[PDB]
């Protein structure tokens, strides 16, 4: 941080904790030892200052569809050896229970589109062959997978 404004702002924010130890009772070593961990905590943010059940499965399926080539789909899901239909097939494969195609899942899809988690690619008038892309970070999908007890790394073709 060479910005004068930002460094001055940081000094203004952190000065009261600088002056607490002397109020509590020119001891350079004492001040530095008392203040060092707070400085490390502050540096963690220099410039910085619970989904429904089926939504998590939709999100992880969308991530898999986005980051897995289509050629390997059967290799990961077929028991013996991107468009919406691929997503539906992958979702049906993943979930152990038979899920009915209730309109509420389509409402969930549209809401996820609204929340800027899934981006619509094709034309708005074309709602029979729509295209989607996933914009969720890998750490986020790993974290949400852990809360579901699912290992997404075992199915990612790129890592394998």
């Amino acid at each position: 941080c060479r910005d004068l404004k930002e460094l001055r702002h940081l000094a203004v924010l952190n000065f009261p904790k600088y002056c607490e130890p002397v109020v509590k009772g020119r001891d350079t070593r004492k001040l530095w030892r008392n203040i060092e961990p707070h400085l490390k905590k502050a540096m963690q943010t220099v410039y910085l200052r619970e989904l429904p059940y089926y939504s998590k499965f939709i999100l992880i399926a969308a991530y898999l569809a986005s980051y897995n080539p289509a050629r390997t789909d059967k290799r990961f899901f077929l028991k013996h050896h991107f468009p919406l239909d691929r997503l539906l097939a992958i979702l049906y494969s993943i979930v152990d229970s038979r899920v009915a195609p209730t309109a509420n899942i389509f409402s969930q899809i549209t809401s996820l589109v609204t929340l800027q988690l899934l981006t619509l690619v094709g034309h708005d008038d074309q709602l029979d062959g729509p295209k989607y892309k996933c914009t969720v970070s890998l750490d986020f999908i790993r974290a949400i997978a852990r809360t579901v007890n699912f290992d997404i790394i075992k199915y990612l073709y790129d890592f394998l």
Partner: protein, 574 residues
């Protein structure tokens, strides 16, 4: 007149009568009164559960405006519950304009695609809260002031374009001295999203602070406790509807308004279906005005007939022949059902108070789970009951007396009619712990019984859950496939009963055409398909068969199963 080329057609020419009648009128009046009370209580609960955040917002705004006498900004996380935002915002604006500032402007992202339109709408709403540019806004503020700040609400910032946001932030930063400005952010996703929308050159000008709102699950628990587990409302629900509503809520939306809609529809259907649902003191007085046909209807009840079979033959004849004695006995049974409802609710609440401190929560955490698992079957007939009892028998004395103190608070609050000796014993207190556990077990066996085991329960219960499913959670694909595959279920024509998956030639043209399409490849050749259809229907004429084929193809294309392809002539994919 409804088939012309022009698509625009227009034509020019009591509430209760559509429901048909006197009993129907009374039922409609009771429906209106009960819905009024229910939604009023819902609003009362909605207002109550936000004080601890509203006061914090007020104090934050006061602290921020104290300096003016760097743009202060408060971040408010509201979750995915898109329906709750409007009600919460109504309450929020009713708080601020009543306390701190009569200038509140809430804005959408849909109606502000450009900064020009944004400023136009902003100044237009500021005009009636009491070319267009920032100088005009400053002059208007000076005129109205000649010092309250101004509050602007951004509801859905996910749909907002960034550029207008940075422009508004940078322009407003240079005129803070001219007029104060404070921003309130409502974010559905995690607060991290704000870092991905504003460049740091713009973000550095804001002093952001974070609040968080109430969780939806606690809201649902409070609503369920206040509106269904209480004794102030005569209507009750069977277990199937509770399970389906809970499934919908917990799996789809986490919204309470949908649950309220389901409850209202259940009440409406219950009053439409049962004529005897006309029926505390109101039912007491309404019994005297009962009609003979309704007396026969009461005589026809399944629970009533089982109860009559339980009684003696002489009492059987007396009930089946006499009316006033029947009215009095039904009155007594209604009072007994009332008492059963009272003690069931009290015992369940006390049991959950005991259960709330149990580790690993063998029988759940909240009211709803214990209530539904008690409604399903008897808890005491399951080995899980024994496991809970043996886990209860290992509690420490200090935790046991804390649980007893909470239960004693419950007793002193609303256990008012029966068993004060229970609280007396609690005050008195391994042997003592075992005695307490045995007494609790005796209470559970005595008082926790399914409502289906008592007669005349059908008056205050509803059981047509499948219609509720088919009217709220539709399955257009399943219904369409059922219509296409096995039209026997809709027609009951034995000519359609051959097998499953085979080809009934007697079936209509659309059904056989769809079934021929199913077995073919992913690309459908129209000439080969037409030949197959002609072969099926065979078991002047050619033109008629071709006409039926064309009509079926057009219908299927309209329904969406057909998309034309130009890769191969006369081919279609699914």
């Amino acid at each position: 007149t409804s088939s012309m080329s022009k698509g625009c057609f227009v034509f020019k020419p009591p509430i209760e009568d559509y429901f048909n009648p006197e009993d129907s009128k009374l039922r409609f009046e009771t429906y209106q009164l009960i819905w009024q009370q229910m939604k009023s209580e819902n609003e009362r609960l909605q207002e109550e559960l936000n004080k601890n955040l509203f006061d914090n917002l007020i104090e934050f705004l006061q602290k921020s405006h104290s300096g003016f006498q760097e743009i202060p900004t408060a971040a408010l996380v509201l979750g995915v519950n898109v329906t709750d935002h409007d009600l919460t915002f109504g309450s929020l604006t009713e708080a601020l304009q009543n306390n701190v500032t009569p200038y509140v402007v809430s804005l959408q992202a849909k109606d502000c695609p450009d900064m020009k339109h944004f400023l136009q709408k902003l100044i237009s709403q500021l005009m009636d809260c009491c070319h267009y540019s920032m100088d005009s806004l400053s002059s208007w503020y000076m005129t109205v002031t000649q010092s309250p700040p101004v509050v602007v609400i951004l509801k859905d910032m996910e749909s907002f374009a960034t550029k207008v946001l940075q422009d508004f932030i940078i322009i407003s930063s240079q005129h803070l001295h001219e007029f104060p400005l404070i921003l309130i952010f409502g974010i559905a996703t995690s607060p991290i999203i704000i870092h991905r929308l504003l460049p740091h050159a713009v973000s550095s000008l804001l002093c952001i602070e974070l609040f968080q709102s109430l969780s939806c699950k606690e809201h649902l628990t409070t609503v369920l406790d206040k509106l269904l587990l209480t004794t102030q409302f005569p209507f009750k629900i069977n277990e199937k509807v509770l399970q389906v509503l809970t499934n919908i809520f917990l799996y789809h939306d986490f919204s309470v308004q949908n649950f309220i809609k389901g409850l209202q529809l259940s009440l409406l259907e219950h009053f439409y279906s049962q004529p005897l649902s006309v029926l505390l003191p109101e039912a007491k007085r309404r019994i005297n005005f009962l009609s003979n046909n309704q007396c026969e209807n009461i005589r026809r009840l399944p629970s009533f007939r089982r109860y009559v079979e339980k009684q003696a033959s002489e009492k059987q004849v007396a009930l089946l022949t006499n009316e006033r004695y029947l009215k009095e006995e039904t009155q007594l049974l209604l009072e007994n059902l009332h008492v059963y409802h009272m003690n069931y609710f009290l015992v369940l609440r006390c049991l959950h108070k005991f259960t709330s401190s149990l580790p690993k929560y063998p029988l759940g955490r909240q009211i709803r789970e214990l209530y539904c698992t008690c409604l399903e079957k008897n808890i005491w007939d399951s080995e899980e009951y024994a496991s809970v009892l043996q886990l209860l028998r290992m509690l420490a004395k200090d935790e046991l007396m804390t649980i007893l103190e909470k239960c004693f608070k419950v007793f002193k609050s609303y256990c008012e009619n029966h068993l004060g000796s229970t609280a007396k014993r609690i005050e008195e207190f391994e042997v003592l712990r075992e005695n307490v556990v045995n007494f609790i077990d005796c209470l559970v066996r005595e008082y926790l019984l399914p409502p289906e085991t008592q007669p005349l329960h059908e008056v205050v219960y509803f059981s047509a859950a499948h219609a509720l499913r088919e009217h709220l959670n539709a399955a257009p694909r399943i219904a369409l496939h059922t219509a296409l595959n096995n039209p026997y279920y809709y027609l009951k024509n034995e000519a359609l009963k051959s097998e499953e998956g085979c080809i009934p030639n007697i079936a209509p043209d659309i059904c056989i055409a769809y079934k021929l399409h199913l077995e073919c490849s992913r690309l459908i050749n129209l000439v080969d398909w037409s030949e197959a259809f002609a072969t099926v229907v065979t078991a002047e004429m050619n033109e008629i068969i071709h006409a039926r084929f064309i009509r079926a193809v057009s219908e299927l294309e309209l329904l969406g199963f057909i998309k034309p392809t130009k890769q191969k002539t006369d081919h279609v994919a699914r």
